[PDB]
Amino acid sequence: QQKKIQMSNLMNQARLKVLRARDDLITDLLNEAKQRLSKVVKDTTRYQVLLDGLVLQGLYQLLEPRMIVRCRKQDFPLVKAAVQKAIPMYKIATKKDVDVQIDLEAYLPEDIAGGVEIYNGDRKIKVSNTLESRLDLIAQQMMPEVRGALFGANANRKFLD
């Protein structure tokens, strides 16, 4: 009688063991991706293009009469250019005159790979537009395709509807 219970516990824990191992593979892959993105932000021209995009997308989502851009101190020269470009593009697209300032007193922690945060005039609304947040957001939304690519498709799934 007790032998049956022992077999159940061994098989059930064995299933969890392999599932945890698969979750470690995903975790390690995401950590490697973060290191690869760190290598990207070490660039200059490619990173400035990312900043041009990130600032524009932040501004378009917040749509406030006044905005403050907060960034890592070492990235200020590049963000300055990104804001100067984002402003005339924003105004044309939205037809709203928004005063966009950069925060020169507070800066993002230097351990963040890169990206920006966008605050409204009273600093009560913030846009989580850093690179690490965007990567985590996309990695989860696209995760079903990661599963299949790495470990194979579900052989028992016949209808995708």
Binding site: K4, I5, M7, S8, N9, M11, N12, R15, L16, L19, R20, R22, D23, I26, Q57, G58, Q61, L62, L63, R123, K124, I125, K126, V127, S128, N129, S133, R134, L137, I138, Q141, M142, M143, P144, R147, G148, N154, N156, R157, K158, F159, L160, D161
Partner: protein, 459 residues
């Protein structure tokens, strides 16, 4: 995917019980999921119930204690509640929110489904056919469950509805004259019973084919509402996309109904009949009717909702509104329980409207229908004779009456009484039936054709 950075708001207009009222929110959605961060670093989840312009109203899943109107931040996801589903999640145990509580990893999704889903297009619905045997004779040889029907277990409070539900999960399967799974959702379950389900499923080796959702009595009441939707959302994925048959057991729908009333009050809706929302009817149908067979696919979903009857009154809106939209009933009694009969299921008031199609040659055995009808009449007569005996005495009875009393006593002792760990297949249940029927001479078995008797009656 959206690939749009999330907005986090620190603007709070006020907090009122379970609700947090936000301000200056950009294009909020109804039913949007948000996450709160309290000043102590504590995180909470919630869902937007009303969006009146920029005034979004969010119900917090956990308690609202500790939330202020100055520092608490609200992160919006930009989307609604969509459950990650996969085949691998079968064999896992989750809480009401869909999070693992079995020390395993988070589900690695194959897709994301809206838990509310859609109604199944009736043009592609297939009438129920084959049977799914439960292993419990009282509901295999008397009121079997067709492969596609929805038949509830009504019980009074205090009866062993949870022990039977667990037994069905351990024993249920196909007739076998690898493609069968059970999805079990317990709403409002107390800690002692929740442990019972988790441990009993793991120990007996059944977990490989069970997806278990536990929503505890002290868990958020809103999570109790999605719990049955998550269970069915998984069932729909497993059944219709992965070509397999799924048995879904929804335990304590009465506790769900109470959680639904709480949500209605949060919306300041005027209560309807007996305090319940006027839309309780469609809400139960929304859950119950996400089942059955579909054209062109080999999967199926069945349901066995289990409901506690308040004050043991079948008239109460909960069992009344349920039964009105389900196909028959199992009905667990109290007299059989007090007499120490397990399972305590009373065959006379029970009914399975689809049994006519569930059983018969090619699905169970040729004689299934005939044995059931004769046993039912014999039990009904035995009860009638027992009532007579109590008035006229034993000496006033004739031989035929004594045979019915012998059947009545041995029927309950051998056929209905089973034990929680004896698994009686459909063929053993019928053989037990014949052992009781061979008490009577052939001429008294009026409901069994002579051809059936000549084949099965002897030996």
């Amino acid at each position: 995917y959206l690939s749009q950075p999330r907005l986090t708001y620190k603007t709070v207009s006020g907090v009122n019980g379970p609700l947090v009222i936000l301000d200056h929110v950009k294009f909020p959605r109804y039913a949007e999921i948000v996450h709160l961060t309290l000043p102590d670093g504590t995180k909470r989840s919630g869902q937007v119930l009303e969006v009146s312009g920029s005034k979004a109203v969010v119900q917090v899943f956990e308690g609202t204690s500790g939330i202020d109107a100055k520092k608490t931040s609200c992160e919006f996801t930009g989307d609604i509640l969509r459950t990650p589903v996969s085949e691998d999640m079968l064999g896992r145990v989750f809480n009401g929110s869909g999070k693992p509580i079995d020390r395993g990893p988070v589900v690695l999704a194959e897709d994301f489904l809206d838990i509310m889903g859609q109604p199944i297009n009736p043009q592609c619905r297939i009438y129920p056919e084959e049977m799914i045997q439960t292993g419990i004779s009282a509901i295999d040889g008397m009121n079997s469950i067709a492969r596609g029907q929805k038949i509830p277990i009504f019980s009074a409070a205090g009866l062993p509805h949870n022990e039977i539900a667990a037994q069905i999960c351990r024993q249920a399967g196909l007739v076998k004259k690898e493609n069968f799974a059970i999805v079990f959702a317990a709403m409002g379950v107390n800690m002692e019973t929740a442990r019972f389900f988790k441990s009993d499923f793991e120990e007996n080796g059944s977990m490989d084919n069970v997806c278990l959702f536990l929503n505890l009595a002290n868990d958020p009441t809103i999570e109790r509402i999605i719990t049955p939707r998550l269970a069915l959302t998984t069932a729909e994925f497993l059944a219709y996309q992965c070509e397999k048959h799924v048995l879904v057991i929804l335990t304590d729908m009465s506790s769900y109904a109470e959680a639904l009333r709480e949500v209605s009050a949060a919306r300041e809706e005027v209560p309807g009949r007996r305090g319940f929302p006027g839309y309780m009817y469609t809400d139960l149908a929304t859950i119950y009717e996400r089942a059955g067979r579909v054209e062109g696919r080999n999967g199926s979903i069945t349901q066995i909702p289990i409901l506690t009857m308040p004050n043991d009154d079948i008239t109460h809106p909960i069992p009344d509104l349920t039964g009105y939209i389900t196909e028959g009933q199992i009905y667990v009694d109290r007299q059989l329980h007090n007499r120490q009969i397990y399972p305590p299921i009373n065959v006379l008031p029970s009914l399975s409207r689809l049994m006519k199609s569930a059983i018969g040659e090619g699905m169970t055995r040729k004689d299934h229908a005939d044995v059931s009808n004769q046993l039912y009449a014999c039990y009904a007569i035995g009860k009638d004779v027992q009532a007579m005996k109590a008035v006229v005495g034993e000496e006033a009875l004739t031989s035929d009456d004594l045979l019915y009393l012998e059947f009545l006593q041995k029927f309950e002792k051998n056929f209905i009484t089973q034990g929680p760990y004896e698994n009686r297949t459909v063929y053993e249940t019928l053989d037990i039936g014949w052992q009781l029927l061979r008490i009577f001479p052939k001429e008294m078995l009026k409901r069994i054709p002579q051809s059936t008797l000549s084949e099965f009656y002897p030996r």
